[PDB]
Symmetry: D2
């Protein structure tokens, strides 16, 4: 039996572990943290990620208790500038914990061996993974799914450009308060942009009938807008229609102003080691596809390992096949972020939706625009 050692229990690592286990690999997954958890409050998935979930046998648990808004709406200075439904392209909003739980439960159901407090500190291309405990594990495949600060990557040495932004946002889950919001379209995604009187934006993202995912975005140089716990007054001033939800947001002492971070590498493979997710390709969140691409790439890795080739050759074939979708999406999302393109509305163009349109199960693009 082929053995895989996966470093990291995020969406990339769990996807890799499930996909490999379904194909008969002996899979062990190692999470550095003391518990299995997902940070970031909420998350969007699209057709591509939902198809991965179908491929993993985890779609049912995800769709139950998650939300597809009637439309993706954009506001500029409180004026609705677009409503987009992507010509039926499937999409979904959920809490991070909801997605995480579904993947963990599926991995456990399949008998994936999951270890917590288990940090990969070094990886060897010949197929050896060293944990912080000093345990050296031999494997036929090593998956570096260990995030932007991947030690699987950096122990080997990959030529790279990394960037941590000065700016960021505050992501929270609060109650919907739907009745208290009164008249409106409060099941929508609403991306609420402003440049005047200050640069403040809220991405309003319903997760289900109970939970609302809010992203509060202000520059780091704004001492009030970037404050945690949230400066209620400055958010209510520019988003008064969300006051009921913002009052609940202001109670959260766990709120963090998290910075954006990107990674791009010359390659994603070395011998029997494959880098997946933020370890390889962390990107700007404009197109809401960092985890989508991570999951597609992890699932696609399992596919290329079923061709009867050596692991080394399968990994090379995998990157060649799948990386361009991620490269283009990363580049375009970065362009969108820098140009504030989403502020215009109607920017989920055919090109913007390329990654979302990809079906990893059939390996074709679907849901034409």
């Amino acid at each position: 039996t082929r053995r895989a050692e996966v470093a990291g229990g995020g969406f990339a690592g769990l996807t890799a572990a499930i996909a490999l286990k379904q194909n008969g690999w002996d899979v062990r997954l190692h999470e550095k943290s003391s518990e299995l958890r997902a940070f970031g409050a909420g998350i969007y998935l699209w057709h591509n990620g939902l198809r991965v979930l179908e491929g993993l046998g985890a779609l049912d648990d995800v769709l139950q208790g998650s939300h597809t808004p009637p439309t993706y709406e954009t506001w500029m200075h409180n004026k609705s500038v677009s409503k987009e439904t992507f010509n039926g392209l499937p999409w979904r909003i959920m809490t991070r914990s909801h997605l995480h739980d579904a993947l963990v439960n599926r991995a456990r159901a399949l008998g994936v061996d999951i270890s917590v407090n288990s940090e990969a500190v070094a990886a060897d291309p010949v197929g050896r993974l060293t944990l912080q405990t000093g345990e050296v594990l031999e494997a036929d495949l090593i998956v570096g799914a260990d995030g932007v600060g991947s030690k699987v990557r950096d122990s080997i040495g990959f030529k790279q450009d990394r960037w941590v932004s000065k700016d960021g946002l505050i992501r929270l889950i609060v109650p919907r308060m739907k009745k208290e919001l009164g008249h409106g379209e409060w099941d929508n995604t609403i991306d609420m942009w402003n440049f005047w009187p200050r640069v403040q934006r809220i991405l309003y993202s319903p997760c289900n009938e109970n939970e609302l995912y809010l992203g509060l975005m202000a520059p780091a140089a704004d001492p009030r807008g970037s404050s945690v716990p949230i400066d209620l007054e400055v958010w209510v001033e520019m988003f008064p229609f969300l006051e009921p939800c913002l009052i609940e947001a202001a109670k959260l002492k766990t709120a963090r102003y998290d910075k954006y971070e990107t990674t791009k590498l010359d390659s994603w493979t070395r011998g029997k080691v494959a880098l997946v997710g933020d370890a390889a390709h962390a990107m700007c969140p404009a197109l809401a596809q960092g985890a989508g691409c991570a999951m597609v790439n992890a699932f696609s890795l399992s596919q290329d390992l079923e061709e009867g080739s050596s692991v080394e050759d399968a990994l090379v074939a995998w990157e060649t096949r799948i990386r361009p979708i991620t490269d283009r999406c990363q580049a375009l999302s970065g362009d969108y972020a820098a140009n504030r393109s989403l502020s215009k509305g109607n920017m989920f163009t055919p090109a913007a939706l390329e990654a979302a349109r990809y079906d990893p199960l059939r390996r074709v693009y679907s849901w034409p625009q």
Copy 2:
């Protein structure tokens, strides 16, 4: 090699033929008409039917050149009473020819032997199909996909209740005239109900950027509203906002006032003969699921024939497994039609969407409400 003879080249027969051919059956399909064509102007499919298309390898050709509205909207007396998006449940509108062409092209690509001017006039449960030419074909499976007036069914004799309504509607494809319609949400499905000043209704159904599917519904006792070609004045009077499209509709000399028709049988099988689609279960169109159920049932038949059982036993197992979804949907659609339930809006309830939610590929219900 197992041989199947399929009577009828509608959506049920083509689905059966493709699904069987994909599983290695030697399939021949017989269409009574001189050409392969689909009547009825336009058609809605939902998740269940779209999943059948995925199973048939015909989804790509269908999604290209078809439309998912941003919302399914209902009007009563020109007042919007509901907007429904079904919590992300996939759905699609297309011309009948668009769906038909996709299925025919797929059947031809797989090497299904299609005959036109080939009418099944008698079927024997032992596996003999007699054509109007006098040709007697022996087969391991006979599929009666030959519509509400099925001769495969009636030559054998199935206890049945059939009903042809006095009332009906006029279904047409016209240009979108989107610019000429001016301000509005003209990519929506809009079910435009009226009881005052007369009983007149238009189901407004965009198929793509070029083609609009209209259903003009008035009682048979209304000599103007039921007239073909359409009485332009009486339609413009109550739907003045559609005048540009109605002017184009009035040019169509091919317009027909078609009656609603239902069939229900005590059983769908006899020996090696299976009845699929309108031959077995024609229903009211309120839930837009007659072809959806027909396609699910045809696809499901192919599945039950892969269990290693006798054809006779597989057919019995098939009906037992799949019929209840169709029975409930038929009953509920008839209830909706009789009570004019759709006129209230917000009537695509979890129960109404049961058939749509069924995934025939995984044999589970998806897209929870």
Copy 3:
């Protein structure tokens, strides 16, 4: 000093009494009822009536505590069909008591001698008024302002057509409940028409920040819709958006289903007797001008009595000058009522607004359309 005896303490009689007293007449007014009061809940005035109030020195007290809606809106089956603002033509809504009080207070301020429990039972063209007490009062002018059942008129004998309708309405004052009505344009006049599922209409008429005037109109043959106190269920069913106000309306045990009533006479004068208001020209309320015309005619009477002619000649001149405006408005309002013309919206045409446009102070038409 010239002496006038006025029969009736309604809007016509009070207007006549004030206007005459301002011109130096010794005026006595006789009200049959035990108290000075105005029935009918609320009332609309337009430019013509507001100009009379200006002429009477009673405009200030009327405008304080009354309401001009931002627009006059019409709904058919809950769909807004028109919004009308009459090109700036002044108009106003108020409670009947508000208008009544303003006129009574002005009459008292001028020293008009007002008697209650004082019914005119006979009038003589030579200038004698007999009260129910048997008191015979001699005067230079007798004003029959004693309503649709005028005894001043009928004691003399005027050729006439009177009509009392079988149908009618329930008029009430309730609290605004503005906050409880939620999203909307609840300061508007909204004429809420329906023919389906039943013939039920509400004229929604805000009087000020505290008081709402509702007219609930259903046919007499409808036992539920015409019931008093109101059948809450049947009104909430068709006007659910007014439920907070309708709950308050249902508490009113004083509610009446009052019938429409009209009067038309061959003449309005006989010797020293002049008939004013409903005594002469009761009309359908479609154009909201019965009191408007009554007040214009009463004020105009005082004007014609300042020409230095005999009272008999002044009265003849008065009717000749002013009656055609009332005749046309009565006729058009009756046409509108019979044809349900207001149900279409946009029916306050230049012709419909003729009476409203008349300025009695300058004797010209203003506020062109």
Copy 4:
């Protein structure tokens, strides 16, 4: 017969001349310009100014061919922030020429002696007016209605503060293009504010079915926004919904970027000389009351001259009676302009509307808020 000499043929001078002529004064009016004309494209009047017009016998000609919008609407960054109708307070929009013509025609009808190319260069408090021709005219009253640069004022010497702003606006009349504007509320006043992406504002003011009054406001430091003829691109960019009207505006080679200008004086009188209008009290246009106050003050002057006092005493009484309304309105309009208060919407408060609410005919405040 009392003789009045009026310097200036603007709204103040024409009002003074008509009002005095109606009271039996021998009135001569002197306009410096070669023709009688009014600059500034369009103008708003309110109840106070409309009542002056009624007092002048010029209301009929003004209301015919002018417009009361259904509402006064305010936008910030294309989002509607308020709709105001002032609780029925009368108001009106018209072209400057429309108002001017009505006043000139009334003055001519009354036999006011109007001279063009007749400039007042000096005034003496004893009642002598010297024209640029050298003609010295003796009079019982001299009216300085000669604008912000009044030579009647400055020849005498009045302690004053004058201010000419660096900023200004471009005022134009263009066709309505109502059909070309498509869906909207295009009969409204719409004050269209923006601070982002640049400081640009359009006051949209329909005058009648044919003519639209536009005020295009940008800072003088903006070389494109302040350009004449208008820089079409920069106006269409921020007001694309007005493109049809802006294309017509760009054709006007007569367009001017006119600066705001204010005047405030310690007194308005000296002996037999009275200063009226912009000569005395030019103000910021935020409350749209510069001409309103000018007309009220000119009309009020005629009233105080009917008390049987000396002209000198009547003038002192006039200023004491009427100036505080103008002082408060000037101050508040300046505050509004400086604070950009109108950008918030809902700022026509009872205090803001004080001047508008004043009725000069009855000398009371009407139309309570």
